[PDB]
Each structure stands twice: as C-alpha cells, then as structure tokens.
Amino acid sequence: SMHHYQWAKTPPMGWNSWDCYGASVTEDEVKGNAEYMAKYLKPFGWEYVVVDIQWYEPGANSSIYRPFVPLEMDEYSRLMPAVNRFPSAKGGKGFKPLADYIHNLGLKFGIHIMRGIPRQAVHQNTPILGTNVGARDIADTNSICPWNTDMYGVDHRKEGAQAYYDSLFQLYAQWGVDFVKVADIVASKLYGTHTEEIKMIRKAIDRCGRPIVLSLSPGPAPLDHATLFVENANMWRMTDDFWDRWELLYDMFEQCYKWCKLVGLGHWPDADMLPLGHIGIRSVDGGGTDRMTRFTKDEQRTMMTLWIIFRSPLMFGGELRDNDEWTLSLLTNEEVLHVHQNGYGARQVYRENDHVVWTSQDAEGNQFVAMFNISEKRSVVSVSLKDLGCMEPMKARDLWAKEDLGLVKHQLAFELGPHQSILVKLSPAV
Amino acid sequence: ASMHHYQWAKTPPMGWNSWDCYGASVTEDEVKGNAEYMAKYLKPFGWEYVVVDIQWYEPGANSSIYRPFVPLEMDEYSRLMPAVNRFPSAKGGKGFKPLADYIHNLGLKFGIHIMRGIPRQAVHQNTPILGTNVGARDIADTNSICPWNTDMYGVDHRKEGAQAYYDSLFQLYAQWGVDFVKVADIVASKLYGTHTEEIKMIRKAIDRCGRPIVLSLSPGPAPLDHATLFVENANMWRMTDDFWDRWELLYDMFEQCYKWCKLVGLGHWPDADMLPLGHIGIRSVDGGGTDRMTRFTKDEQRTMMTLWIIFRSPLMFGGELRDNDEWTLSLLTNEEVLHVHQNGYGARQVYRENDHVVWTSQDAEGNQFVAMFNISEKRSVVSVSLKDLGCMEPMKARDLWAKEDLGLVKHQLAFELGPHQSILVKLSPAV
Amino acid sequence: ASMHHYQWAKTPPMGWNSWDCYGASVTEDEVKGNAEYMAKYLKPFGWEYVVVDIQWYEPGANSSIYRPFVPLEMDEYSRLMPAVNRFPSAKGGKGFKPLADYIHNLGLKFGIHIMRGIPRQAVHQNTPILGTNVGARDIADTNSICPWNTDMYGVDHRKEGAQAYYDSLFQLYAQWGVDFVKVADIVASKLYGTHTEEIKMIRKAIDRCGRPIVLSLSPGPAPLDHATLFVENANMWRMTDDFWDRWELLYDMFEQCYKWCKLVGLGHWPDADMLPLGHIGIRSVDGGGTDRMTRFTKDEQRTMMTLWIIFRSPLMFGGELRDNDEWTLSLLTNEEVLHVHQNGYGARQVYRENDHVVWTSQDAEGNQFVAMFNISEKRSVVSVSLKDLGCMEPMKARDLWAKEDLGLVKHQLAFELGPHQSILVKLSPAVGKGL
Amino acid sequence: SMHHYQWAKTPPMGWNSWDCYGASVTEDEVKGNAEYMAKYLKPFGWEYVVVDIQWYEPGANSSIYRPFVPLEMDEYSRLMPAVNRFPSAKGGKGFKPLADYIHNLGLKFGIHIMRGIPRQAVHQNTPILGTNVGARDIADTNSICPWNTDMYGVDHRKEGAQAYYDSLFQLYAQWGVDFVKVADIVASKLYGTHTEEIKMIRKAIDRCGRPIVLSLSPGPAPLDHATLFVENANMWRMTDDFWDRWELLYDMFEQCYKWCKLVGLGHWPDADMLPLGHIGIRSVDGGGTDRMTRFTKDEQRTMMTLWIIFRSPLMFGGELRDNDEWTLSLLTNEEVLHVHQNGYGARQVYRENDHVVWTSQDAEGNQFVAMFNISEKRSVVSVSLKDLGCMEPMKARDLWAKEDLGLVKHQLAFELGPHQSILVKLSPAV
Questions:
Q1: Domain B1-345: which topology?
Q2: Which CATH superfamily is domain B346-431 in?
Q3: Which of A222, A224, A227 lies nearest to residue B261, judging by beta carbons?
Q4: Which of A96, A425, B328, C195 has CA 20 to 30 A from A375's CA?
Q5: Any contact of D with A, at least 3 CB pairs below 8 A?
Q6: Considering CB atoms only, which of C2, C223, C262 is closest to D227?
Q7: Inter-CA distances, C431 with B236, C50, C403, Å
Q8: Between β-strands A213-216 and A179-183, what pairing exists: parallel, antiparallel or unpaired?
C-alpha cells in the first residue's frame, strides 16, 4: 500500500554511534566504523552508518546532555553539524561530504533528529525556509521533551509548520541522508505519542524526493497506535533504551510477543540497538562505563537469536574496530541471517516456566526454531514437531554452529543453561 | 495459518443473534422462526449461524435488564442449562441438542452465549465439577465478578479443577452440537480489564472438545495491547462496547476499524458488533430505545453495512428477521457487495479529513473496492484521486449497492454525499 | 499557630486584584485609581491589599492571553522587573518602590504576582544570580515548565544557587515594599502536579528577607494530600482553577469549601479565588466573556459573598472599582456581614441535601451565624432546626445583609429562597436578655 | 460540633485480636486478654477489648479467609457469633454475655464488622427487620470487597437500606457493644471510599441510643475525604495493615505528617494496631508466623513514641498474657501517656536526612519533643529551642527513662542509633 515500504523490504541493518559514543561521536569515528562495515560486514547485509543524537552540539561529551546550550544552526532554523566534531562540514556543507564518502564505500548514511524546532530558533525568531513566518510562530507553547532541552514541538495547525519539516528533509536529502531516527516522538512521560508530527514528518519525507527510511524512538511504542506506526514508519522502538543488562533482555521476549503481528515488509517493530562489543566509551548510560558488553556469550547469542527470528532491525552499537573474533562472528553467519532476511510468520509457540520457543519459516519450506531458556536453572527445553506444524520426521540443523543434528522423530529437545538459546532449521528428512 | 481453529472461520462469521431483538429472553419458537427465515432467504448468501444470546439459563428473563441474584438452571456438575419453560425441547436434561439438531437440519449452525466463569450459586453451594473431586467453590476467583451481571464468579486458572471445569463446559456444548460460542465479560471490564487467563483456558477447552466451535469474545473495547492474544486465540473479538442504532456509535466505529485494520485476517476477525437493523427492542430496552424499527436512516444503514462489509467484520443480524421489509432484506442479499466481504482483502483507510473518510480493499481478480463516506453533518462532495488509491491508469467504475455502471474514470472518484451517507464503488481495468 | 508568618494574616486577606478586569495588562494609573477608591470607600471595612497580577514585566501584554516567547523586562541578576511603559514610575531601575510607597501612603498594602521559577531568557543567555557565581542556567530544572505560560523554567532546589536566586527575588520585593505575593504555577499542574520544593524555597526566601510578605498560592485545585504543606507554608492557597462569573463554578465551590473547611484557621486560608463582581473583562477574555458587568445575578452575587464570608475565604475584588454602582459597593461595606468573616470561626456544612445547603459558624460572644442556600434550579423553602445548629433554647434572629431583626425563633429557621438564592442570619440568645 | 466526639475525648486505647489470632479468636482468648487488661493496664487508660474480623465464621483458623463459606446469621440477615468459638452465645444470646463479662471488669467491648450485607442473605433473600423488604432488594449489584467474600455492599438509595444498618446497631447496642471497627469502607482497590455507607452507619449509630465509637479500616484513607472522616468517624486508618516490619514503621512518619492537622478531640487518624509481644499465633500476615515481634526494642520505642505524640489510638495486637516485663513497660509509663492524653498541637518540626523531630504541648506549658533517627546510620539528632518556639532555657526530662537531664540553653541534641528515638519533656527552668 505505502510506497515507502519498498525502502525497507528487509529490516534495516547497520551501526549507530549512541551506545559507544553517546551524543559525542566525531567524523573520524564514524569514518572508521563505516570502513570496518565496508570491509567485513557489507556482504552480510550491514549497510547503514548512523550518526546519533546531537551532532549539532559542539560540546557534547557524553550520553548526558549539556542543557540549554547553543547549538549549530543555519539561517533557516535548521540544525547543522558541529564543525569541530565534523571538520568536513566546514563552509556550510553539512553532512554531504561524509555521506558521499559513506556512499562511495557502498553504504548508507543515517542521522538522528529530535522532534520539533530548536528552542533557540524560537527565542530568536529565526526564519523558516520558503515562508515569511518565523520559528516562533510555529512552535507549540506546551510541548517539550522531558529528557532533552534542544527543541520545542511544532504545532501542525500553524502556517509554516509543514514548511519547516519539508525544509529539514530537503536539507537531509541534499546531504544524501538515507535514514532518519526521530526521537521524542513515540513515548513521552509528559505527552504520549506525537501523532501529528509523525504525520508531518511522513509528508516531508515523501516530498523531499529521496528514499529516507523512518525510524521512531524511544519506546515503549503503544499498541494502540499500531496502525499509525505501520502505515507511517519503517521502524519504531518497542522499548525504552536497551542496554547490556539481562533484565532488559528478559523483558524483550514479551514485547516481541506483543508486536509479532505487526511485523512485515517495510514496517519493523524495533527491539533497539545491539549493545555488543566495546561500548560506553563516551556513554555513561545503562549503569556502565567504558567496557566490553556485560552480556555473557550465551546472552549475546540469545539476543541475536531473538532479534533475528523476530526480524528486528539490527543496529550494532559497539565501536566496530575493537571487535574481537567472537563478536564479529555474531554478525557474519549467513545461515542465521537468512532467517532475518527471508523468514516470515514468526510467532511464540509457547512460553512456560521461563522456557520460550519461537518459530518462523521461509518460502522454500524451511522451518526455523528458536528455543530459549530464560530461567535461572539449566533444563531441557523441548517442543513437539506437532506444535510446530510438522506432521512427519524432519532433519535438524544448528544454524549458529553450522552443524547437522540429524533426524528428529517427535520433538526438538536440548539441554540449555540459564539464559542460553539455540536456533535450528528443520527440513524434510531422507 | 498457525492455528488450526482459523480454518473454522475462513471468512467472517455471518448469522443472527437474539440480543438486540429479545435481550436475555428469547424463546425456542423465536429462535426457530428466525432460523427458518435464514434457511429460506439468507443461507445461500453466507448467513448461517443462529445464536442464542445471554441468559438462556435464566427462566424468568424478560428484558435486556438482568434480574440479579436469581436462581439459574444448572445440572449436577455446576454447568448452566437451558430454561425449559423458554426452551421446551430441553426437557429431560437434553439441553440444546434438539434445538441444535433442528437448526443443523435446516443446513445452519448453532451458537450460544456464555458468561465467563462459574455460577455464583455453584460456588456457594459448592457443587461438583465433572472429572475432578474438587468443588466449584475451590476453583473460584475470590476477587472477580462481572460489573454488569451477577450470575458468575470468575474462575482461577491457578486452581486445580479450573481447566477441568472449562473442559466440561465445552464437552457439554459439543454434545449439544454447538458450532459457535460468544463469551461475555471477557475482554473489557471497568473493574479488571482483560481476562487473559480465562481466554486461554477456553481456547484449550474448545481444542480438547473434539468439535469445531468458533470463538467470539465480548464486550469491547478490546485493547490493542492484547492484539496477539486475541489474534491467536479467538476467531472474533469486539472492538467496542455494545453497538446500537445511534449515529454517534456508528460514527465512532470508523476509528476503531482504523485501529484494528492490520489484525484482520483469515480466521481472526475484529468485530464491529451486531447489526441493529429491522425490528429490534422487542424485549430489550438498551440503546435508549424500546420496541421499534431501527432508528438508523437508510443512508446510515447503508453506511454501516458498507463499513462492516469492506472492513470484513463479522455480520450478525440483530433484528427479528421475520419482520424484515424488502429494503432490509436487500441489505443482506446484494451479491456484488458481499463479494467485497468474502473475497476482498487488505482493507485500509486511505484518508480521513474533515469528517470525510475513504476506505479501500481489493480482490485477487484485479478489482479495487472503494468505500467513500461523509460522516459530517453537511452535504458535501467526497473525493479521492486514483493516484491515492494506487491506480496508475484509468478505470471503470461501478456502484455496487445500486448495481449501476458509472463509466470510465480518468483522474478521480467524486460524489456528492448527504450527511452520514456513503457509496461503495468497484474499480476495474478499462476495456 | 506555630509558624511566625501566621501572624501576618490573622484574618483572611482582603483587597483588589487586577486579573479579572485587566488580565495581564494593568497600568500604573489603573492600579492607583483602584487604590484611591479603596482608600476612600473600603479601607474602614478591612479592604487593604492592592495586588498587581501576572506579567507586570511584559511590556506588550494586552489581554488575559499571553504573548508567548516574548522578551521580558529584567535586571542584571535574572530578576524580572516592571515594564516602564506600563509603570512609568519604575523608570531608572526603581521598580515598584514608588508605586508601593504611594499605596502605603494611602494606608494600604501592596501585592504582586510572580510565576514560579526563573525566566527562560535568563537561562538561555545564562545571566547571573545575585550573591553567587553560578548562572541562571545552572539552577534551572531541565524538565519543568508551566503548561499555560512560557515565561519561566522551574528552579531545581538541588542545585547550588537555587535558594540564592529565590532569596534575591524576595530581597528585591522587600526593597520595593511588597507586602503580599501571589505565586502561580505552583500548586496544580496538568503536567507535574504540586511544586512542593519550590514552595519550601519560597517560604525560606520570604522568611529571610526581613519583611512580612503574605504568601498566596495559585492556581488550584489544591490537593488535600498536601494540606499540611499548604497549612504550614502558605497564608492562602487556591482551592480551585480560575474562578469566573458562571453559576456552574459558583455551584462547584460549595463542595470545595466542604472539603477544605477543617484546614481553615488563623494565618492559613484556603482560597475560593477572586470575586468577579462589577466591571470585569475590560482587557480580559477569560471566563467565556468580554467587557461586561458580572453575569452573576444579584442573588448569585450575594450567594457568593455569603459563602466566601462564612467560610472565611480571602476576599480579593476583581472588578474595576471605580465603575462600581451602589449595589456593588454595598456588597463590600456591610459591617455586620463582615464580622462573620473577621470574627467567626468553626465554619462547617450542617447539611447538603437536594441542592439545599446550610453552613454555620460562631463568634466568641456566643453569636451563631447561619448561611442558608438554595443551589437548585427551583424556588423552595430551606430550613434547619435549632437542634442541628446545637442551639438548645430559643434565639433571636437577624438578617445580616438586610440589617433587619427577624424576631424570635423557637424551633427552626426556614425561608423561601429562589434558585441560587441565599440568606445569612445571626442567632443570639433570647434567654436572660431584655425585651 | 458532633455529639459523638464526646465518646472519644482521648484516642481510644485497647486490645485487638487480629495481629495475634487473625480471624479466629475464641471466647477464652478474649476473656484472658481482658482479665490481663483489667489487672495490669486499666489504670493507664487501656479499656477496649476488641474482637476482630469474622467472629461469625465458625471455621476461621487464620488471617487467610476461607472464602465463600456459610456464615452464622439470624433471621434478619444479621451476622451472629459462632457458638463453637463463643460458647456463651449459645441460644441466640450473641455477644451480650461476653460483653457483660467485660463490662464487669470495668472495660469496654468492641467488634469488627464488614461493610454491607451478607452475600448469603442476598442469595436467600432473607428479611430485613422492621420492613417488608428483603436483603436482596437492598444490595448493590456491583460492590464487593476485593479481599473478603462475606458481603455485598448495601445501596443507600433502596428502601430498607437504612433500616438494615439501623437493625445492626440495634443488635450491637443490645449486646452492649461500645466500639465498632468497620472494614472495607475507606480504601478499596476497586471502588475507593464508601462514603454513602459511612453516612448510613453514622446514622444507625446515632439512632441506636448507645455510645458506640466508630473506627474505619483499612487505609490508606484519602485526604480528599478528610472532612467526611473528621465529621463521621472517631478513628480512621491512615494506612494499609501495619505489621512488625521497619519499612512500614518508616512509612508511617510521612502519614502522620500528612494527617497531623485533622487530629483532634473525638476524631483520631489511626496508625493502626501495635504489633508488639506475641503475635502471629493464628495469623500468617506481615510475612511472619508464630513469633515475638520482629521490631527491635529501639523500633518498638520508636513506634510507641510516634503513636503517642501524634495521638494515634493505641490498640495492642499481641497476646497480652505472654508479655514480658519489657513489653509491659511500654504500656504502663504514665509520663509518656500524658503526652498522648493531654498533649495537643503535634507537628513535624522538621524532617531532613532521615532525622525527624516532632513536638507538641500541654495546657500547663510543658513541651514534648520526640526525636527520631530513621536512617541506617548512628548520628546526632538535634533541634534548637528557637525552632521549638521556646524562648528561654528549659529543664529537660527523658520520659521513657524517667530521668532528669538538666537545663538546656540552646538546643536538644542526642546521639541516636539507627531507628532509635527519644522522647523529652521541656518545662520552665526555676
């Protein structure tokens, strides 16, 4: 139905600067992560290089924002990259040089934006491109983000509002942006879901003439607005910010269950960025500091396995260049990725005593089974072939291990440690 | 197609239900008369379920207003049974089997309403449960009632004997030949919200009983938060609180359809509720009316049918069918319209603006259906471009309700529509 | 009476407030005119506060509707100041001192409105705070605004310099001679609820400034959950969102009085809000009206006065006083009625039934006051037994508004009252008294 | 203003069977506790002997109710004492013999009731005394207690409703009841505050011709209904059920602060029963079993001190006959009790860093000060005489220790362990 679905036929895969560098990533760091992606990851589907929040804030240095500070901005109330952090933006060029480079590696470029219009634009009453009204005239008088002070909300009822959003995406399209992550737009302690601005953004993107994938954050996204999100966004966060803490991983199983019927081509409920590898370099969120992920290997696999079978977007959050061989291996298994790229129909077969089984399939008849022990005790996790919809014996294969497992006659069953999972492919026997 | 029970409702269930016309109080003769009418005039068009609504076990029921704290007919295993004064064929412990046999012999299916839980009287007396030696009292929830009816207490799934009781109900219903159950006090509750555990117990009881029994959940509003649960466990679930012949409720349905449109699919049908058409309120007092013909105008009646058709709501006629006039019958028996319900898919809201709304769906044959609605208080032209419908070339247009070719359309559809008026159009490729 | 500031409002504050008549936009001349009228006609009856309501620091204000994100008049220490166009005497950095002096010289007191917090323009520029080296930006709350006015941000009590800022405000206001402050966006908020920490900072600032400044909190509805806080920190606090000349709001006030009646006492007055009497809406567009004489009927005006009087609400007249007619003035100058407000205590709802309500209070001389109200839509007799009032013997009765003896009452008070009509009666002993 | 205030001029003091015997106390146990009270406690103000919930449930055996069971009841839908548990009730005499016994010890008798009318009376449609209506005709069809199944609410709009409540208090007056604790009346997860039944009960009591003190439970009582409670009840629970757990004692400090201005002659916000001594004998609530209170001595003193100065009612919840000398000493200190009986004006002077100070005074100009360390660390807690409103030097006395402390010029200050407090009387010097 919606033409923008075609811009994310499979769930976006990429890297994002938040979990490693907070609000404070530099051009060099972005370039380095992109080169690593081009060399090691691109053949496996990884393509978006996403510069997260506050690229326009020259003093940023953490995940903790510096409030009420001046921001880099043009003459039409549009935020611009901080030239100290992004030297190629010198001379009003913005992100075009960086995006060109990223494109020339065969990759795509993404940026984060905050909903609304900068508070400094409203206070100075700076202009809006393509109209005579000023920033001050389109601002909402009672709309802010509770966790960031950079913007005021824009009031769609005002003349000039749509013109401002159109102008942002004209700029982003000039730069060659392929992906935008909009924040303060879905969940808000204060206001709930900013529906009208979602619609203005959809329209601005559609008018800008370039394919720009739309990601919405933070969650929890309400199910009440499922139609709105399905029709307007290519991805939307199911959850508040995800981090390397078991509790949050445990909690994702329920959210996936809740959203599984809205997952489809072009429209991807989002389990959030993968806190893997080296994170917290200039971030202080998630209760950690400079570290390798606190997920155990079993946990890392369990996460990847859930996000894969569910078909969450996959946005690696660590500094890629500090990957070890284990971490890289999680990203380069073609057999596992097939489940994410070509699987469909994922569903929870059952959840009982903190054992969970999910299943999906491909069009070639392969069935994929993810089996999870999310309890604190080692146990056998099993599922009958009948509950999977398989009426005869099947062959099984362990996709992470790339190992044939042999014939299965009545049930799949595996000993799994606490927090441990397995991902299996079933195919006809003999 | 994960769930086997989806095959029991491959298209949205179509039938009649006794609530809007007879409240809690329908009799056997009334049910049979409505079934005979269905068999004769409606069955070849898809209409097949004959559904006895709430309180068939309350011999004194006489209205849509319940008589609270009264005794109920019940067998020796805490299971509610039909009131024999209202359903004489149930004499001698036969329950609904004779009435269901009669209905089946007309080529129709038989449905009943149940209230969630176990009868209060069974819990106080501590009567037995079939297949276990715990009593009714031991499976009841100590803090779960229905705020608008006093017959039951909720059943606590953590108690031994709970599943056994629900299994035993569906054993009984399968013995009778029930093909459809509408469960009430299960989805929305002022007091408790959604009774998820009992939904699951019911799903299991039905799956164990050995007979196809379609599952309908009521009342709404169903929360989207539980979309997965409903989609996987029920064949239909009410999007709204009880729907009646009042414009305000019909107006409100537009939004609910928008909110639930992505969960509509084979076997799992969000439910816009029964159709308050024809003669209603005979022994019902709800909806702010009494004995009457529907207060919906013909325009409103067509707008309702048009939304429910394109969206693919189940269709449960609520009036006393034998009193249908030609107009009312015509709303049920337009083959071209019903093709949209039976063979359309992908219904979506194209836009809603200034109380004008357009919906569209399609079939596999290259037709596109467009429902255009003026839901404002003023007469106005409602339009939609072919481009917004996804049609790249000119199309032939036809008015489905009027069965009238409208000719070639090159750029847009546009019609003058009165307030609360609509039109349903098929677009097909030009010659 | 354990808090010293109770002594600053031993009886409920009485005065005039520029909001209902001029919105945010009152001028120096208008303030002076109202003060002069108060001095001449009202002062001997207890009316003394002359209160300049919101946005005296906004030079372009012209309505009850605020002009958002506009520059505000401010000094070099992030403190808002009077707009010199609207208040010419404030020229040369003098602020309100001249205007306050003039009011004081009439034998009156001076009040102003403030918005909770620190001006957004101070925070964005990071202007200084008097008495510290931290800037305005460093004391702001990052997630605290007012949902209906854009002038400020909230101040975060946990930050060094927060208290110093509020201290500096009340040093300024004390210099000017302010005797009363109404703080807004402090009690009820759609977004944040009650700003308790700032209430406490404001209490402390006032206590440190060395001058008696009566503290009024607004808007309501004030939650009972914070009763102790309000009782111990404020002299008055609004029970209700903004009150206007609409019967529905007057009807509603009966319940709020009932809910707050036990917290009424010397120095701490639940507030039923300003009296929309006389000429209002001159440069205000709120309450669903424009330039008008109050839409309250005479009966309704009396009913309002009678409830606020017996309950002991503060009395803040909201009309332009100089356009008072005789009738309106008469509502304010009845000493017998005012005695109930000044010297009554123990007010309570005797009953409320079928939209008939009776309240009673008493004085220390054993007089008993009874206010009887028909708040229904039909004319009816409203009555109450002497027994229900706790009177054990027959009493003499007097109609306090009419100043008319009603004679002896043996068993009950009863009066035929039109819809929205009320009566206020004094009962005094007959036994042991001459004839 | 309200005549019933004269029935509780000081906060009621007594014993209640709940914390020790749950719903299941017997006649002998009540009599034993009463005899103890008469012998050891009565001269110090302790007088009420209160039979708590479900005296009408013959099978009761715990604090956990047996749900949906038949209940002992007369022909007029009125619950009656279970004769197995209360043998003197044999022959329809109800609690009159027991109350007479208690009265003959110079004590007062109290019972607990649940709001409403018994479900069994509604289902059988038993009569209401004095009318031609039945129980079924006065019941609310959507009003239950979420934590007990014995009753349905009564609908005040129905003919007979008042007549039912009048009949209950006629019965209770016949027995000689002096105090009724009504439960399921103030806070309800499901319905909030049952204001209409509070008013019917007030009226029923006023019509019965006997002084019956009215206690409402459980809390938390909403301040929003302060007036209603102040004018209709003699006591009302500030909190959900209180037990011997520090966390709940800590929490009470705030509730006292919130309610302190509504405390006054005849109308006492209620901090709930004192879990002292031997409790949990046939109760399983509070996360304990058969035990001596888990409160440390300091905590016990801290509890007593706050309840005393605030002027909460004092209802001892242990089995009195198993008291040791320590526990008894908490109940028989006249100097401390004077603060409860004759103090007034209690207020929180401050609360800072988990140190709290309260003060009140008497009419002779004595000033009482309760100083609490409610933190986890030993520390000095202090308060200036100026903050107390004391203008000159004062003599100080430790009321619990009965020890003169000497002259105090500027401040009171004491080293206090965590959870420890002290109670001091200040009086004029020389």
A1: TIM Barrel (3.20.20)
A2: Golgi alpha-mannosidase II (2.60.40.1180)
A3: A227
A4: A425
A5: no
A6: C262
A7: 79, 45, 22
A8: parallel
